[PDB]
Amino acid sequence: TRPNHTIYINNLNEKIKKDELKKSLYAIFSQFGQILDILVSRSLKMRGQAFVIFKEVSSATNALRSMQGFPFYDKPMRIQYAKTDSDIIAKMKGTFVE
RNA sequence: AUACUUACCUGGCAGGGGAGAUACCAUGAUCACGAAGGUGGUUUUCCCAGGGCGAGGCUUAUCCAUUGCACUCCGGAUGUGC
Numbered sequence A: 001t002r003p004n005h006t007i008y009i010n011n012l013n014e015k016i017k018k019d020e021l022k023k024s025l026y027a028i029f030s031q032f033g034q035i036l037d038i039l040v041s042r043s044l045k046m047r048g049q050a051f052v053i054f055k056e057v058s059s060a061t062n063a064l065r066s067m068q069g070f071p072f073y074d075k076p077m078r079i080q081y082a083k084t085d086s087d088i089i090a091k092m093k094g095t096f097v098e
Numbered sequence B: 001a002u003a004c005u006u007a008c009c010u011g012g013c014a015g016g017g018g019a020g021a022u023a024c025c026a027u028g029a030u031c032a033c034g035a036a037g038g039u040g041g042u043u044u045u046c047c048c049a050g051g052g053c054g055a056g057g058c059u060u061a062u063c064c065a066u067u068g069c070a071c072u073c074c075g076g077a078u079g080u081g082c
Helices: A016-031 A057-068 A087-093
Strands: A008-011 A035-041 A049-054 A078-081
Touching: A008 A057, A016 A035, A016 A049, A016 A057, A049 A057, A057 A078
Parallel strands: none
Antiparallel strands: A008 A049, A008 A078, A035 A049
16 A cells, blocks of 8 residues: 555456556556566466566556546456565665575 | 099289397217308487377467556466478
């Protein structure tokens, strides 16, 4: 609930393949700022979710405000901040610990 | 029903993966101990020559469950072609 470099998105349509989903998320989510990476998995735990890593928390915060509920494959998007910094975020800060 | 002699009617010969290495078996080699080799085995590397085991892996739908906070690929089963 506390702002983060990374936003967490869930309630995504599970039929879309990883490369398809990464592509359209980059397209959809680039409108708000420079994106370093979009990580998707289709595993049981990780299917239906994506992490968009922004350079600035403010793009993440603004992205959260705008896309909350956004229609995506017949489903409103749910967005949160990542609970923890992403390794590429944490190494840039030098906060990273295994 | 069996064997013997004759006439008539039918019909193509050689064979059983192949090339190397075998110290060991067989051939118990016709000259005062002996062969080599070869032939027929057993052992041993390959052009893989066809098969049997389908573990593992690749492509895509059906069914079931998941609202999941990851950054070392990977939820379970059936079907199509490898």
